[PDB]
């Protein structure tokens, strides 16, 4: 229920090396399935998940041509931005493209995205209506005028409303064995004494998919919005994810702390406590 | 599949 598709482009200029580096990655939800690198010996789109490998040669050849044209155009766009900001030809710069579509459990489109950043900072975004541009500064407005004259918004909208949703539903069908299954987190609590009167309680959620998860700690019955250290979700490396949350606790009151885990694969929201061995 | 565009800014 409710899926998404995303393409991420990164272009880094290399003034000591002529042409820039272009990398593209494609994701269905939290599963990457394609990749492209302009630095390869023979740059082509490559598969990164099994359920995409069944596509025929025309798919790969067409997408490879797409990426090559995109890389050239991004080189020219980086030179354009350098001009816009009156920056020098010595430094290296980064242009990032983000586009994709979020659909619902039915299949209909819920939201589209098509935005761009320059040197890590927001540059220009296609608004939610898919017909208007929000620009960040004056150079972004130069680009906005260029794009309004070329009716770029309509092309973005044609992709987001049409090809994006169709191919996303195709991907969900051909990969439904994994893309629709929600791997629940294997959860456990753990206890390390820091000294003699304090202890750290760590709540562990491992091996879950998708990445979205909520971990909270609660003393007696009240949460810890200031005592709960949270590491950000990290990839296990097998397409599943991990997270933990820890609390400092006075020694001798380790049963007044409950850990609440909420995940899409959990039949109901779950609650654990230190099961001391 | 990626979008069959090469937008320039």
């Amino acid at each position: 229920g409710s899926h998404s598709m995303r393409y991420f482009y990164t272009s880094v200029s290399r003034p000591g090396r002529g042409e820039p580096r272009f990398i593209s990655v494609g994701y269905v939800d939290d599963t990457q399935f394609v990749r492209f690198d302009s630095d390869a010996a023979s740059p082509r789109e490559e598969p990164r998940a099994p359920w995409i490998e069944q596509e025929g040669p025309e798919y790969w050849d067409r997408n490879t041509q797409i990426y090559k044209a995109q890389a050239q155009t991004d080189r020219e766009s980086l030179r354009n931005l350098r001009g816009y900001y009156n920056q020098s030809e010595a430094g290296s710069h980064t242009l990032q493209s983000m586009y994709g579509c979020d659909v619902g459990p039915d299949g209909r489109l819920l939201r589209g995205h098509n935005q761009y950043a320059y040197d890590g900072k927001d540059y220009i975004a296609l608004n939610e209506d898919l017909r208007s541009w929000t620009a960040a500064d004056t150079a972004a407005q130069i680009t906005q005028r260029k794009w309004e004259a070329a009716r770029v918004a309509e092309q973005d909208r044609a992709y987001l409303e049409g090809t994006c949703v169709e191919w996303l539903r195709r991907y969900l069908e051909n990969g439904k064995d994994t893309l629709e299954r929600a791997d629940p987190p294997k959860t456990h609590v753990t206890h390390h004494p820091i000294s003699d009167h304090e202890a750290t309680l760590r709540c562990w959620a491992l091996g879950f998919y998708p990445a979205e998860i909520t971990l909270t700690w609660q003393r007696d019955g009240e949460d810890q919005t200031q005592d709960t250290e949270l590491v950000e979700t990290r990839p296990a490396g097998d397409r599943t994810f991990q997270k933990w949350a820890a609390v400092v606790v006075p020694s001798g009151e380790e049963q007044r702390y409950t850990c609440h885990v909420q995940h899409e694969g959990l039949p109901k929201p779950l609650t654990l406590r230190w099961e001391p061995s | 599949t990626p979008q069959d565009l090469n937008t320039m800014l």
Partner: T-cell receptor, first 112, second 112 residues
Framework: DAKTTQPPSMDCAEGRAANLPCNHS???????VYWYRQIHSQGPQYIIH???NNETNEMASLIITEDRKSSTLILPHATLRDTAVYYC?????????????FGGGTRLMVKP | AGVIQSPRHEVTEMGQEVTLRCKPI?????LFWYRQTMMRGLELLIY????????DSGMPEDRFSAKMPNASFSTLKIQPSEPRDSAVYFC??????????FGEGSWLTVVE
């Protein structure tokens, strides 16, 4: 790539209305219908384009059916100048279908 | 001001270099080279978008080279020219998804 069908030839009386049909059964939602004409091998000339709703301008009218599977170019009062080849071309909104691919066209003779 | 093409006429012996030049409508980002003979009707040679070659499958495999160094200049070069290259080469340009506009054409006759 070429996606349209037209009658190879068609006559019309000068001063009368010329109805040039076109079939594009396989058209897609985000594809436009364009109409060009060519006179004496000169450069093809844009006439009109449309998406779904009827369109009219200072050269012709474009009538697209409800199911968008066929259309008609209407010259109102055809003159002798309008004797030419008329191409009905589908044009998409991405790089794959951004270019015009010319089919047979309809060779329109305006006879006085 | 429309699309500007040069030369308008060229009659030259075979075996030498032919260069056709095109200035698109200023502000346009898309450029097309088409060719017209009697046999084939109107064929796309090359499609540039933002000076990047997007589609060149219509390019002959040898002696034909298309080039866009900037958004206001494009060349098509034939070397060496052969009689089978005789045709009318049209340059067209477009702003975004607006209508594509054609130049007046370059009529090349390569004589044996």
């Amino acid at each position: 790539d070429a996606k349209t069908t037209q009658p190879p030839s068609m006559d019309c009386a000068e001063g009368r209305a010329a109805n040039l049909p076109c079939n594009h059964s396989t058209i897609s939602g985000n594809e436009y219908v364009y109409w060009y004409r060519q006179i004496h091998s000169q450069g093809p000339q844009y006439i009109i384009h449309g998406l779904k709703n009827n369109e009219t301008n200072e050269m012709a009218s474009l009538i697209i059916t409800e199911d968008r599977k066929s259309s008609t170019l209407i010259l109102p009062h055809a003159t002798l100048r309008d004797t030419a080849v008329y191409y009905c071309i589908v044009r998409g909104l991405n790089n794959a279908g951004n270019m015009l691919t010319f089919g047979g066209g309809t060779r329109l003779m305006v006879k006085p | 001001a429309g699309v500007i093409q040069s030369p308008r006429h060229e009659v030259t012996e075979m075996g030498q270099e032919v260069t056709l030049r095109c200035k698109p409508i200023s502000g346009h980002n898309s450029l097309f080279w088409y060719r017209q003979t009697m046999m084939r009707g109107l064929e796309l040679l090359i499609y540039f978008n933002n000076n990047v070659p997007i589609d060149d499958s219509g390019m002959p495999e040898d002696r034909f080279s298309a080039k866009m160094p900037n958004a206001s200049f494009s060349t098509l070069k034939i070397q060496p020219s052969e009689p089978r290259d005789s045709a009318v080469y049209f340059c067209a340009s477009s702003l975004g998804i607006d209508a594509i506009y054609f130049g007046e054409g370059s009529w090349l006759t390569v004589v044996e």
